Structures are given as structure tokens and as C-alpha cells.
């Protein structure tokens, strides 16, 4: 899996499109989904499945810590 620094770079770009600069909203996660596409796993590859898997605290947005866990899961 990518290093925490590489993942942080990608996270920051996606998270600073709209709203909270430090969280990825569902609408921002749509762009993450479009970029990761066929690398997303079965059961976490629709936008709904993805955020449900990734958003551990249920605030409806994806934090850096949550995003790191997502990237780990995708790459085994
Ligand atoms: Ca954001
Ligand atoms: Ca969250």
C-alpha cells in the first residue's frame, strides 16, 4: 500500500474540493471512486458501499485516518 505521506497527498487534493478541507464528503468521494475504479473491491465499489465501508464513525464524511484504512483494504 502507498506510504502515509503518499496517501496524505492524494487525500488532501480530494478533501479540498469542497466543504471541510480535512474531510472527503460523499460528493468528493465520488471523484475518489471514479479515480480508483476497478481497483475497488467487491462490496465497496458503488459510492454507497464505499462510504459505508470507509466511514467508520458515521459522520457521513471520510477522514484521513479512514481514507488510509480504505487504501490498505484495496491493496490487500
Ligand atoms: Ca472536503
Ligand atoms: Ca467519518
Domains and CATH numbers, the chain: 2-76 (1.10.238.10)
Burial class (CB within 10 angstroms; exposed 0-12, middle 13-18, buried 19+) of 62: buried
Q: Which long-range contacts (CB under 8 A, 24 or more apart) does 27-32 make?
A: 28/62, 29/54, 29/62
Give the angle subtended at the CA of 20 by the CAs of 15 and 70, to the nearest 5°. Answer: 40
Alpha-carbon span 22 to 63, nearest angstrom: 7
For cell 467508520, the residue is 56
Question: Cell numbers of 60, please?
Answer: 457521513
Alpha-carbon span 36 to 74, nearest angstrom: 9
- Resolution, expressed in angstroms to one decimal: 1.4
Provide the experimental method for this PDB entry.
X-ray
Question: Cell numbers of 16, please?
Answer: 479540498
Find the 49 Cα to ligand 2 centroid distance in Å: 14
57 assigned binding-site residue = yes
Alpha-carbon span 63 to 42, nearest angstrom: 22
49 assigned binding-site residue = no
66 assigned binding-site residue = yes
Ligand nearest to the CA of 61: 2
Ligand nearest to the CA of 64: 2
- End-to-end Cα, the chain, rounded Å: 8
Amino acid at each position: 500500500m502507498k506510504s502515509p505521506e503518499e496517501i496524505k497527498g492524494a487525500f488532501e487534493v480530494f478533501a479540498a474540493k469542497e466543504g471541510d478541507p480535512n474531510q472527503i464528503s460523499k460528493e468528493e468521494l465520488k471523484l475518489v471512486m471514479q479515480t480508483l475504479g476497478p481497483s475497488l473491491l467487491k462490496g465497496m465499489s458503488t459510492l454507497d458501499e464505499m462510504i459505508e465501508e470507509v466511514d467508520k464513525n458515521g459522520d457521513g464524511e471520510v477522514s484521513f485516518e479512514e481514507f488510509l484504512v480504505m487504501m490498505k483494504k484495496i491493496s490487500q
